[PDB]
Write a protein that binds this ligand. Structure first.
Ligand SMILES: [Cl-]
Length: 257
């Protein structure tokens, strides 16, 4: 899609008429293929595998903040004539999902967030994040990505990963435009995201949390939310990648009931 595209790039897959859409949102540096292994177990549903700004086919789409990502999401949904939908988001995508849900997306059935941060409490926690994210923006923007990603996957959230998993992920994410990656990282930084705890409780939509059992960080964060948390065994932050069958199982419990 071009630089100034009104809608995000996404891969649509049609399912049974009358079943809601499953709108899948990848994490930072991923693309629309992220949730395809898990989503394809739900092929009776219509699936929208979105490319977030700066990622995959949405690489040229530029955003200032979350309001812009939400608008784009809204326009993309209208574009595919999606009125009944679920937002299934991993990490950055989970954060995008929660942000869009709390701004208000008409037709939203529910949000399923996997390792998504509900938001930091004060502007001090935000400052610490702005400082750390300003450092990441600079590296993605100027350095070779095989180098930035090797350290990115060395971050505490990815501690649970083995060196073979980190190798495969570094290679996979390095197929990206650092400049557009960096812009999105800055646009939707934890530093600029509000505390969504009250908003995620005072919701009109259904809300479910998924978490790898090894992801102690997001397990504790989930515990603070008014949501059904589904702890995915033998899995880290990206639980759908490490354990796709377990995440399908959890999604089946959620969606097929
Ligand atoms: Cl990842």
């Amino acid at each position: 899609v071009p630089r100034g595209s009104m809608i995000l790039h996404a891969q649509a897959k049609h399912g049974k008429p009358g079943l809601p859409w499953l709108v899948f949102l990848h994490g930072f540096s991923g693309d629309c293929h992220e949730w395809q292994e898990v989503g394809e177990a739900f092929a009776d549903y219509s699936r929208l595998y979105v490319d977030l700004p700066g990622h995959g086919g949405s690489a040229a789409i530029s955003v200032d903040g979350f309001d812009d990502v939400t608008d784009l999401l809204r326009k993309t949904l209208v574009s595919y004539n999606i009125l009944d939908f679920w937002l299934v988001g991993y990490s950055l995508g989970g954060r995008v999902a929660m942000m869009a849900a709390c701004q208000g997306l008409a037709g939203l059935c529910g949000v399923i967030v996997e390792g998504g941060h509900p938001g930091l409490q004060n502007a001090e926690q935000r400052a610490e994040a702005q400082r750390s994210d300003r450092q990441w923006v600079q590296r993605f923007l100027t350095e070779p990505l095989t180098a930035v990603f090797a350290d990115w996957y060395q971050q505490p959230v990815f501690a649970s990963l083995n060196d073979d998993q980190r190798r495969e992920l570094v290679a996979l994410r390095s197929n990206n435009n650092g400049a557009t990656l960096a812009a999105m990282l800055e646009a939707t930084s934890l530093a600029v995201q509000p505390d969504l705890r009250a908003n995620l409780s005072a919701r009109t939509f259904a809300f479910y949390y998924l978490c790898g059992e090894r992801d102690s960080k997001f397990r504790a964060l989930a515990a603070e939310l008014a949501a059904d948390c589904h702890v995915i065994p033998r899995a880290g932050h990206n639980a759908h990648r490490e354990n796709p069958a377990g995440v399908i199982a959890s999604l089946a419990q959620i969606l097929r009931f």
